[PDB]
Symmetry: D2
Amino acid sequence: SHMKRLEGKVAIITGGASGIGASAVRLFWENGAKVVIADIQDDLGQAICDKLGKNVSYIHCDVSNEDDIRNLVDTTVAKYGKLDIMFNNAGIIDRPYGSILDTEKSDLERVLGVNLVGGFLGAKHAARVMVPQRKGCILFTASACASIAGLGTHAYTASKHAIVGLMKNLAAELGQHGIRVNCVSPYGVVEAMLSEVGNLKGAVLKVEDVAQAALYLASDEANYVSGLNLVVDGGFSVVNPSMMMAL
Amino acid sequence: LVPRGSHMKRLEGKVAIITGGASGIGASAVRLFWENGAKVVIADIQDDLGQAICDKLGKNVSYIHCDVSNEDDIRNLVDTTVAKYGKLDIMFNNAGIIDRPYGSILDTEKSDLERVLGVNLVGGFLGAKHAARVMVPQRKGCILFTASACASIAGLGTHAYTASKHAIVGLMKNLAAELGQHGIRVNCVSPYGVEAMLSEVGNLKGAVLKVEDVAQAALYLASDEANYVSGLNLVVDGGFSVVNPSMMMAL
Amino acid sequence: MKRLEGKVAIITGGASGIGASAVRLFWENGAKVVIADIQDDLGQAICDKLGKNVSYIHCDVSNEDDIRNLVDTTVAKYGKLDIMFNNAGIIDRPYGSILDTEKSDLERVLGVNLVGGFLGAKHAARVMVPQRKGCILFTASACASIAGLGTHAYTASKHAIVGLMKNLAAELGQHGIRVNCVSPYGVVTGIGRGVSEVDVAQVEAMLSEVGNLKGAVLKVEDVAQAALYLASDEANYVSGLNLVVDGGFSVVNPSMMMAL
Amino acid sequence: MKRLEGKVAIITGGASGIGASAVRLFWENGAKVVIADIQDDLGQAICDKLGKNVSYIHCDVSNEDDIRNLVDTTVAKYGKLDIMFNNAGIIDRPYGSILDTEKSDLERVLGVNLVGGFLGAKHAARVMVPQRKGCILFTASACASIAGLGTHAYTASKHAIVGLMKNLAAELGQHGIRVNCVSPYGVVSEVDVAQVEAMLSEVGNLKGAVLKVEDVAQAALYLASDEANYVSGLNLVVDGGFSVVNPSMMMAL
């Protein structure tokens, strides 16, 4: 016997056509939610719609464009009459690694535009429709890089810290309206180095791990969870193992 | 093409010990873990209450008298559990006490601080040590603590209580670092919940903390769905500990 | 005395506020001080007041050309750069809802607060790494430690600065460079489009009423003193530190103590 | 020059290590310093060397009667107490597994580190609340900021201290009293300890520098002085950035 942990819920998932987003689309759909996929990869997005069927729709959305975000939220509410979950998952990386001496102003702005501005716009317009409902859940995909240095580039790390901080500040403002705000912060595998240097040996981060954290946070199981940075990194961001490794 | 949900027995096959399991959060978690297919050992010092849960829930739930500050009690709790079921999957160090709901450092008795520490910190220490004893040779396991939202913000608990729960968070993270080498996850759940005032001054309007909220956080952490969650302080407080609302309220 | 003897420091936003306090304090402690700002009259006034050891450069911290010139001119003047204090910062509003926050406002705040900090750290690192020494400082804010204090755009940008500061502490520690930030309470902003002086006064007045540390009021000197400790050799092993100056506001939710 | 002129400071653990470094440094900046320790001979040698503005009180910080005597005599000597520096601390081991931690060892580390700080802040608050002024300091540890650095018993006790510091900052701020801690990187048998200190200096984040006791005393001096008049609730970490980074990825490249 099985259960639908999101029955009747309406969820928007940016970056939903691939990776963590698509995993969360499939999982939310499995748990009875109507899912709006928001992305810029129309071929992938529409394919998920054809696979899963009527409860899933695709909308082209550049999250850095406020008009796209407005259309995304407004057509979803028009379609389904309500918005329960805004999952600002879309993200990009400027580089795997690199020095501050070599970062370009334009790359930093591109990473900020998608990661921070997009999540900001997504939260603004979800709050726009959620506040009159007196209920809702706003989620962000942050990153373990927001909890510890040495995991990402300076631009990416700065952008993800900003998301976590935006998360806490929105939980403070929107709590008065019954709206919960949280984020999920994964380690890697958005495997070789990650699994070897990771803290939890014998485990590997899979996209489903992030989706399942988002599912918990988005469900009524998390009815009193707000302001939480739900880190999914096997404990990587709580340790500096330089001593253990040298003992 | 047809949605199929999550299986209702998320802890099927797992063996879990819940200290403080005879009332409150612990009893809520016992019932929820039982509903999810776990074998559950209630560890407490309220024997009549704990056995009444077992009589209601049946054979998958048993009771063990355990003062968590007593290492012999903890050792026996872990050892009887392994003898009964062959393994230990989840060690939920939930038992906790308070010296007072509130009070000044000037009033705080040394003996009260020590009793709060014995149960909350030393007991959690002992429970983790003996869970790890059997858990390291399995190369798997989940060790949990009930900490408190007062480990994330001041103004919510007494000094003794708040200090003991910070210690638990620190212990959780240190243990996540050591035992991760053996595949073992370590996390805590930090609940918000004088109770009438906590509900009025909470950050999340339109909802009140109920013990099932905490049980659900513990279920998530204990489940294989959280297989890459370690070192996490899972706060369940509606945002209370992320905000100083003094100036919001002065606008 | 003279905790910064012979040291060369750049202070963005140095013509007013905390920046101007830090300019004076560093100068009293023997530093050469380059003021970087866009209030030319105010900055030249300070230069005329303090003498040869203090100099002014018109600098838009969001402009990389400006930052590149500010660093290189400083090096050409004094042959080294010891302290880069990325203090310039603006708010969009003293308070306000996410629902009426404008994209352009967020982008403007990011441009000064985050991109300007990024650019300042980049060009300081360019000359400090060969030195195998240097100290890079940011003025963040107490709102990077607690919600309820700044707007969403401002708070996000200051969290971003704290993250940058820690990430730079990890990269630049290998070269002997320390990176820290100071995070004050109160309302902290230079001149900015649509920043009312009435609204700032009203909020600064409320913040002094609801502060945690009674009997004291935060002054610009308090923040300058924190920057001076961090910049001095007395902080030789201090890096990655968010030095919060807020009287304890960000560690407490006093809703229970108030209601009791 | 003298950054603590007129101030009266108690420094537990003041006869050696960080405590003795702070005792010297505070005295050099004009403070009256009461050394509180259980190394009577070392502590009295400091007093003889520095003169009558420095005194010694035998005090086991886990004993309340010792703590009360310490505070009360200090106030009797000088009429006030400005700074309560709860610096005394012990480790159980340099490093070890949870599997071999002994209950008694954990209780002893808690007794000195946490209960001692608790008691010292209690009786300091007793005298500074009527003054409507004071600064209460703790020596915590960088291992309260990151895992992998201290043993479980030590780390738990220093986390507890950081949380006590913040909770006191909240209660006592209404009386104008500031509460902060300093959290040093170093480990601070003797060879056991030196081995780990040497290893810490090899794996530190900040290259070209080593933590010295004077670094920690300097952080305490800043926090104790009027230069930090609006600093409360602060965990002043002194660790060259070690606790903000996991270099595992950097190092594998």
